[PDB]
Design an enzyme around this catalytic site. Structure first.
Site, PDB file in Angstrom:
ATOM      1  N   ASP A  57       0.834  -1.179   0.000  1.00  0.00           N
ATOM      2  CA  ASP A  57       0.000   0.000   0.000  1.00  0.00           C
ATOM      3  C   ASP A  57       0.872   1.233   0.000  1.00  0.00           C
ATOM      4  O   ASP A  57       2.103   1.180   0.031  1.00  0.00           O
ATOM      5  CB  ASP A  57      -1.069  -0.036   1.115  1.00  0.00           C
ATOM      6  CG  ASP A  57      -2.333   0.807   0.779  1.00  0.00           C
ATOM      7  OD1 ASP A  57      -2.333   1.575  -0.167  1.00  0.00           O
ATOM      8  OD2 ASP A  57      -3.362   0.477   1.434  1.00  0.00           O
ATOM      9  N   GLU A  92     -11.532   6.525   3.854  1.00  0.00           N
ATOM     10  CA  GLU A  92     -10.520   6.050   4.716  1.00  0.00           C
ATOM     11  C   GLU A  92     -10.689   6.718   6.062  1.00  0.00           C
ATOM     12  O   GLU A  92     -11.777   6.734   6.590  1.00  0.00           O
ATOM     13  CB  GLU A  92      -9.124   6.122   4.036  1.00  0.00           C
ATOM     14  CG  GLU A  92      -8.960   5.077   2.988  1.00  0.00           C
ATOM     15  CD  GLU A  92      -7.707   5.258   2.108  1.00  0.00           C
ATOM     16  OE1 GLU A  92      -6.542   4.965   2.609  1.00  0.00           O
ATOM     17  OE2 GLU A  92      -8.002   5.638   0.926  1.00  0.00           O
TER      18      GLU A  92
END
Ligand SMILES: CO[C@@H]1O[C@H](CS[C@@H]2O[C@H](CO)[C@@H](O)[C@H](O)[C@H]2O)[C@@H](O)[C@H](O)[C@H]1O
Ligand code: NAG
Ligand code: NAG
Ligand code: NAG
Length: 606
Positions: free
Chosen positions: A289, A495
């Site tokens: 990520d 997020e």
């Protein structure tokens, strides 16, 4: 195979494994480490790409050549970067990735599909495969060859700010919706070996199952936090859909920021190498990520040398650096020169990267196709998004008593009707996060049709449509309305910004619903990424629809409101009575939902 200057890896007729091996055997260590390095377009130049033998670029959320860029602008950008990479000694094309997670959503004019939670509501895996097909076309319209999708998180707690990116709290639904993968990539051949990567060619994209593993299981839905669950639970809830993804040839897997029982995923050799690589037999590439390796440590970035060691030894193949490339490349080079990371591990990483690139046809078609530009926002794809939006809607209430006339479907011909609410005429709000910007935005951010526009496009010519964002009760009662459609809900988020312990919609939303419904019969359209506290909204309303985050095609909402199609969506998550209940999932011992998973009222088309 003939010509004096013949190089096997450049021969399209040769088997992929033989091309990979031929190329690998020629590479320097700098060339190998460069393949493992993915950088942001924001830090890329031709000289950087060439000098550092870079393997990949990405656009993170909102990383665009300019606001409003055309498809051709995107193609020109990507080709500029490619020309630089193709100019290296070995001419290894870069792969360009982007978050095309509900359409090609960073791009102005791209079709915006419903987010994953609404797709879950459709229980329609073929629809989702078609959406993958259409997304791949719109990604390739912009010259990009790689999408960071699907998110196959199984969200077990709606307080998570990414819950909308999960198709369901039920892994079986998530598994079913892995049909995105062969839509994006193409169907695998009859003979196919599970875990092999696959992309059909230049009209398809590489996919990415993300985020491995247990991103949906974090304590209290805290993004990037710890998933505290035994192995049996990880394997029964969070893992299954990864095996479906292997079966469908997913080309890449992105590792989660999260931890499992306190072990960072980005440092978890047992799961990345032991399980994904060695047990599921994944043969594509494993990507980090964004600054994922940095976050192995606390504070993040406080021992980057360790981050590189730990992640690469764990089995990651490509690192989304994405900005501090020189630090990464230098440190990894030092670790290999020192024996800390064996050449075997570099060679595995590079074999997997190359395997994907050759398999997908990237050596044969490294440059964009201008004729694909017109795929962007293509009306046929909007028609598909409108279908998906309509199918995603879950009708929660259609009458205040069991003996009232049902309010939906509404008549298209009425003297005057009211459309109201913060979310009635706000395209950005209907699309939610990951649309133009990382965190989404407000207003007319792209090409689409708001709920108000959809109503005006639907109704009889004699029907007067009045819009008021936040009318007071008197305005409603004096207006001579037949009925009202009132749309409210969550603001866009993504997020950690969306992690939310209270799950109550912002005001004015309930106050608008109460003012409207108090004066005329109302259908409330709730726009959200998740279940939210909804009893007050239900009490006020004649009818209430959970429309999730339906995307650019607001006519999907009116297609069901006005009866062109019946409501068919069913909840893909539990609707809680209160947030103190959470986590609370179908199948739990103490299961006391407002509405259970699978709930949804229906209507018949008029
Ligand atoms: C705050 O920094 C911004 O973060 C976002 C999301 S982090 C990470 O990014 C990956 C690549 O875009 C996604 O595939 C993934 O699902 C995410 O968790 C990043 O997109 C921005 O580039 C960065 O500015
Ligand atoms: C494994 C992990 O990510 N744990 C974090 C913890 O370090 C942090 O202090 C806390 C803040 O609420 O959230 C959780
Ligand atoms: C009624 C209430 O307390 N709302 C808060 C809000 O300030 C915030 O947007 C959200 C995310 O932290 O948590 C909630
Ligand atoms: C308003 C309306 O038509 N409701 C009907 C219901 O009576 C019928 O059983 C069902 C299946 O045909 O279709 C629906």
């Amino acid at each position: 195979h003939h010509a004096a200057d013949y190089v096997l890896y450049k021969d399209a007729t040769k088997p992929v494994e033989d091309r990979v091996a031929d190329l690998l055997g020629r590479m320097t260590l700098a060339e190998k480490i460069g393949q493992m390095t993915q950088i942001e377009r924001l830090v890329a130049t031709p000289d950087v790409l060439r000098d550092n033998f870079i393997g990949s670029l990405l656009s993170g959320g909102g990383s665009v050549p300019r606001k409003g860029a055309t498809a051709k602008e995107w193609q020109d950008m990507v080709d500029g970067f490619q020309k630089a990479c193709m100019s290296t000694r070995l001419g290894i094309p870069m792969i360009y990735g982007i978050d095309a997670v509900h359409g090609q959503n960073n791009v102005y004019g791209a079709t915006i599909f419903p987010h994953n939670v609404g797709l879950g509501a459709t229980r329609d895996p073929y629809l989702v495969k078609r959406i993958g097909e259409a997304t791949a076309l719109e990604v390739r319209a912009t010259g990009i060859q790689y999408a960071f999708a699907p998110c196959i998180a199984v969200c077990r707690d709606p307080r998570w700010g990414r819950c909308y990116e999960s198709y369901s709290e039920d892994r079986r639904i998530v598994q079913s919706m892995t049909e995105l993968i062969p839509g994006l990539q193409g169907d695998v051949p009859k003979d196919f070996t599970s875990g092999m990567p696959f992309v059909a060619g230049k009209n398809k994209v590489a996919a990415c199952a993300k985020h491995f593993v247990g991103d949906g299981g974090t304590v209290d839905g805290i993004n990037e936090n710890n998933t505290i669950i035994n192995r049996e639970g990880l394997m029964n809830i969070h893992m299954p859909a990864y095996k479906n993804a292997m079966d469908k040839g997913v080309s890449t897997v992105m590792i989660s920021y999260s931890s499992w029982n306190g072990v960072k995923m980005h440092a978890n050799q047992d799961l990345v190498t032991g399980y994904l690589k060695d047990t599921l037999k994944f043969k594509g590439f494993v990507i980090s990520d964004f600054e994922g390796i940095d976050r192995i440590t606390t504070p993040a970035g406080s021992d980057y040398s360790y981050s590189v060691k730990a992640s690469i030894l764990a089995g990651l193949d490509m690192i989304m650096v994405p900005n501090k490339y020189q630090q990464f490349i230098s440190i990894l080079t030092g670790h290999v020169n020192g024996g800390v990371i064996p050449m075997s591990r570099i060679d595995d990483a590079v074999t997997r990267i190359l395997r994907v690139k050759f398999t997908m046809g990237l050596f044969e078609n490294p440059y964009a196709d201008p004729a694909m530009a017109e795929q962007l926002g293509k009306q046929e794809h909007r028609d598909l998004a409108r279908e998906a939006a309509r199918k995603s809607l879950v009708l929660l209430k259609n009458g205040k008593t069991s003996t009232d006339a049902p309010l939906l479907p509404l008549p298209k011909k009425a003297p005057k009707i009211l459309v109201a609410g913060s979310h009635a005429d706000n395209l950005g709000y209907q699309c939610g996060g990951w649309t133009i910007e990382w965190q989404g935005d407000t207003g007319r951010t792209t090409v689409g049709t708001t709920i108000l526009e959809a109503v005006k496009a639907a109704v009889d010519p004699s029907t007067v449509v009045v819009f008021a964002e936040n009318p007071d009760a008197e305005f409603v009662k004096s207006g001579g309305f037949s009925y009202a459609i009132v749309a409210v809900g969550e603001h866009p988020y993504t997020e950690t910004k969306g992690d939310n312990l209270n799950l109550t919609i912002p005001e004015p939303g309930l106050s608008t619903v109460q003012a409207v419904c108090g004066g005329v019969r109302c259908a409330t359209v709730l726009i959200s990424g998740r279940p939210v506290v909804v009893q007050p909204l239900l009490a006020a309303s004649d009818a209430l629809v959970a429309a999730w985050l339906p995307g650019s095609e607001g006519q999907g909402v009116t297609d069901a409101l006005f009866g062109d199609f019946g409501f068919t969506g069913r909840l893909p998550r539990t609707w809680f009575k209160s947030v103190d209940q959470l986590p609370m999932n179908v199948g739990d011992a103490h299961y006391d939902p407002l509405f259970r998973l699978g709930y949804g009222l229906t209507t018949n088309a008029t």
